[PDB]
Amino acid sequence: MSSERTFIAVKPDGVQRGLVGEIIARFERKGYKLVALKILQPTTEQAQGHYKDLCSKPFFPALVKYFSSGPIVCMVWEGKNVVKSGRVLLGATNPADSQPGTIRGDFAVDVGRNVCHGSDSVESAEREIAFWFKADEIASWTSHSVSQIYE
Amino acid sequence: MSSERTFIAVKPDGVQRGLVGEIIARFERKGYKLVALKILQPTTEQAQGHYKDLCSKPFFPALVKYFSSGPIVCMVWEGKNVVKSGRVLLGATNPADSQPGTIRGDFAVDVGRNVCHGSDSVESAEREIAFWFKADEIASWTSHSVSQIYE
Amino acid sequence: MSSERTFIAVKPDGVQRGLVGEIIARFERKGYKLVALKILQPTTEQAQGHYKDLCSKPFFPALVKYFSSGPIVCMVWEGKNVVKSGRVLLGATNPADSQPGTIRGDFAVDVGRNVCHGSDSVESAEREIAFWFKADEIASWTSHSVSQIYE
Amino acid sequence: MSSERTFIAVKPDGVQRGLVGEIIARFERKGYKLVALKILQPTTEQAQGHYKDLCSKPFFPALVKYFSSGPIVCMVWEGKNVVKSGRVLLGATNPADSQPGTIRGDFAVDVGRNVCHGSDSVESAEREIAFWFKADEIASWTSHSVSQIYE
Amino acid sequence: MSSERTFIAVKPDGVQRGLVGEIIARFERKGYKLVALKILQPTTEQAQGHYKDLCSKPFFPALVKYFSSGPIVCMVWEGKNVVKSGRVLLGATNPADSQPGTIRGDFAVDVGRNVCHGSDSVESAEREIAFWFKADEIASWTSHSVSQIYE
Amino acid sequence: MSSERTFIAVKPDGVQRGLVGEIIARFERKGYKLVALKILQPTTEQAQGHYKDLCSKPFFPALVKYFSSGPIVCMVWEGKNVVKSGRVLLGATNPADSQPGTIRGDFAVDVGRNVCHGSDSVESAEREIAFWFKADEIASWTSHSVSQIYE
Ligand SMILES: Nc1ncnc2c1ncn2[C@@H]1O[C@H](COP(=O)(O)OP(=O)(O)O)[C@@H](O)[C@H]1O
Ligand SMILES: Nc1ncnc2c1ncn2[C@@H]1O[C@H](COP(=O)(O)OP(=O)(O)O)[C@@H](O)[C@H]1O
Ligand SMILES: Nc1ncnc2c1ncn2[C@@H]1O[C@H](COP(=O)(O)OP(=O)(O)O)[C@@H](O)[C@H]1O
Ligand SMILES: Nc1ncnc2c1ncn2[C@@H]1O[C@H](COP(=O)(O)OP(=O)(O)O)[C@@H](O)[C@H]1O
Ligand SMILES: Nc1ncnc2c1ncn2[C@@H]1O[C@H](COP(=O)(O)OP(=O)(O)O)[C@@H](O)[C@H]1O
Ligand SMILES: Nc1ncnc2c1ncn2[C@@H]1O[C@H](COP(=O)(O)OP(=O)(O)O)[C@@H](O)[C@H]1O
């Protein structure tokens, strides 16, 4: 099911600690396709609508203030199982339950500063993709390698 | 039990995607000993006898055609627990159930293209070793490091 | 002087070979600040204008058509001497004159498939950046580690 | 709980196989703080008091002789959850039950030669810290990054 | 020109230090194509013939006996300028004149323990390859990414 | 000649950026032997004496105060030509004249924030080592792989 996409974001602490290329390179070596990319500082409202599903949690306002306080890098990747493989690569929410070899397990310590975001489902990936990206910032191309990665 | 050996093969998709040195280096850093090495294109019959145990599976013919369609790299490694440590290093059959830090978890997406093979048991390792290698292509040497890795 | 900017493009061949994060990581290690990023397929038009100042040369239309055959990743890095140093990280024009340790040194064979592009001077950086980026695609932020990197 | 510390030791086989920087770098990338460091050859008595809790095990004397036979490198690291994250990073006692991405899973084969030690609890970390280090060999400093790693 | 071939040998000291996959990876990154590989212990005879064109020199018998004290890994890589570029990846003869980024730059101290060997010219490559490999040990394949690497 | 020693210091800026293990790893790869290590904050006194032989220069007090603003990691490596080669791994004084592949090449921008320090000669090594280390802080050991590295 090769056309699946997920949205991955490096977060302000990930951008500040020099981790964007490291994380891009993990998904590249895996065989996934980068189809979208930008760096920007979310606004409060962007930070709020992105984490909309957790407005009741008492961490919410500290989260929205932190996410909107510097540049994040947004990406979209495409391939088979990219959403769930995305989350296996990122690691558990708390970097303390996160295994070595995962992004959060290798580079982060605190659940509040956990470097990177990844869609947790296909329907959520499709909603995060449409939030941050206009269709048309989404490059369509074909990897010279798809026959080495799929069939 | 230091004399155990396993057979590891990079497969056509692993060779094409430039992953042979990466995988050799993982077993090296671990402390294992490379005792055999070659690059060749299996034949249909080689591809069939190597995967002999699965002639009833409906993936078999696509597998045998894929395995025989380009060069693989065969290796044999020697050390304590090398067969089972080999399989922990390779990762689950499906690269989607495979953890980050494992060969299939780090570089592959599709079960059909999963970069590398490893004997799954000692008796199977001994049968794959004898299939691909003549005795005599098997170098005997002693690591200057065995006293740092064992005792 | 510390607000100097440079334009780095990963070429279509860099993107197709899975080099994007590797080049980003190297700029980040060296202490530079990423302020703008994107992926898109240059039209022939943008290839001609990006390379206007070389239209009279024989390779120019080969060059033109290649650069617009696939997505590229455009970047703008900030920091002190980032223009000379970007040139330095990328290595000579022609990978045959490129030292290992540089991106062309390590990754490239043909001058025609040399993976990446970097502004040759400050003037050229200013042109290529306004060329490829609108004012609102640029982030402005300050890196927490400015004091560890700049006297 | 940022002031937690743990004691990590590379062991004689880790020092001999050129693994100290690799292991220091793992804890660095994770966000932890190095607060203490030295290289020395334990004595028999140091080797015995360090592993005091296992004087009844029949491996004890081979262990104490091995630990005291060359230089180890001792370190103390500081951060939230550093003791338990330390042990997740090191891997299972036996390098054969240890996952890829962990120090013992990536570099070791034999339980008897397993490259590195890590405190297994806070009270044990505090006792190993006081055994090997005088207060005053413990540098107090503040990472320019604590606001990127915590809050 | 694109069918140029080179002979790379990892020396016994490269094999004993766990460098085999590191050197393979570097050739592969740079875009070269591996076509032949093996491990074996050179007899003194093969050491003399491999180095015939230097029998009159004082180091020659030191050289001869070392090169035949342990397994080596022989390779043949294909691509454009692969002979000059292999020399380039390996770095100067004497690691004291070798830049970091090169294999001797990064890994070697003594000219007598310089890890790896590479053909000095096309003539020499042709000789050393037919020297060390039979026609049937050579793979012939075409790399899926030929177009990303070669104009 | 094989007992030559050099003093490497990671500067406060190297420690604050998470470079300590990266620099240790590079010395270790190249085959050098670590014999002494520690972390501490130089007093202004020790900064003045470490750099006595440059008190007349204009940068000297900037230099003095920086070097004593934070912990540094001091090291002493042993091996053949380790003084010239340490200089070589670190790269030119001023990172603007430093090749990629070197520690300043890859990691540094300002001559004032150049990450690391290395003895410029054998005399200077002898001075800086007795300067920074007591006789009992030095380990003496022999590396199992001495024969793989030294003719
Ligand atoms: N207990 C908590 N304390 C502070 N911040 C939290 C907590 N749980 C979650 N967050 C912040 O909220 C983000 C979103 O949480 P959630 O969607 O449940 O996890 P995930 O990012 O792994 O899908 C986290 O990644 C973290 O930055
Ligand atoms: N469901 C499947 N679809 C396509 N190919 C498969 C499937 N299962 C296995 N194969 C191919 O068969 C190879 C051998 O399968 P098997 O021996 O069960 O796994 P393993 O290689 O992990 O021991 C796989 O590695 C894969 O290349
Ligand atoms: N002599 C040549 N033959 C073929 N292609 C060339 C030649 N010179 C340049 N090219 C191609 O066009 C680009 C020209 O830009 P140039 O000013 O020559 O240097 P740079 O890329 O180092 O800034 C290269 O990066 C390369 O892909
Ligand atoms: N079965 C065993 N055989 C030989 N040595 C062992 C064995 N179990 C433990 N040791 C040695 O003892 C050290 C301490 O054991 P223990 O404290 O239980 O494990 P850990 O180091 O993971 O906390 C081990 O790391 C290993 O070097
Ligand atoms: N002056 C010397 N002293 C000691 N050993 C040497 C000397 N020159 C060469 N050697 C050894 O013999 C080999 C000789 O081959 P050579 O033509 O000198 O260069 P290369 O290996 O760079 O092709 C080296 O790779 C090295 O191990
Ligand atoms: N011209 C200069 N301007 C500013 N700072 C300098 C200058 N020269 C040296 N420094 C600082 O002081 C140190 C001086 O030592 P030096 O003999 O110049 O070389 P090295 O560090 O390469 O041994 C440097 O490492 C650097 O941080």
From TrEMBL, chains A, B, C, D, E, F:
Residues engaged in binding ATP: K11, F59, R87, T93, R104, N114
Domain Nucleoside diphosphate kinase-like: 3-140
Cellular-component GO terms for this entry: ciliary plasm; cytoplasm
Active site annotation, chain numbering: H117
InterPro entries per UniProt: NDK-like_dom, NDK-like_dom_sf, Nucleoside_diP_kinase, Nucleoside_diP_kinase_AS
Positions of ADP binding: K11, F59, R87, T93, R104, V111, N114
Highest taxon in the source lineage: Eukaryota
Enzyme class: transferase
Keywords, in A-Z order: ATP-binding, Kinase, Nucleotide-binding, Transferase
Chain residues that bind AMP: K11, F59, N114, H117
Short name of one Pfam family: NDK
EC number: 2.7.4.6
Cofactors, names only: Mg(2+)
Swiss-Prot/TrEMBL catalytic activity: a 2'-deoxyribonucleoside 5'-diphosphate + ATP = a 2'-deoxyribonucleoside 5'-triphosphate + ADP
CDD domains linked: NDPk_I
Presence of the UniProt keyword Transferase in the record: yes
MF GO annotations: ATP binding; nucleoside diphosphate kinase activity
GO terms under biological process: CTP biosynthetic process; GTP biosynthetic process; UTP biosynthetic process
Family, per entry: Belongs to the NDK family.
NCBIfam families in UniProt: PRK00668.1 (NF001908)
Protein name as annotated: Nucleoside diphosphate kinase
Gene: L1648.07
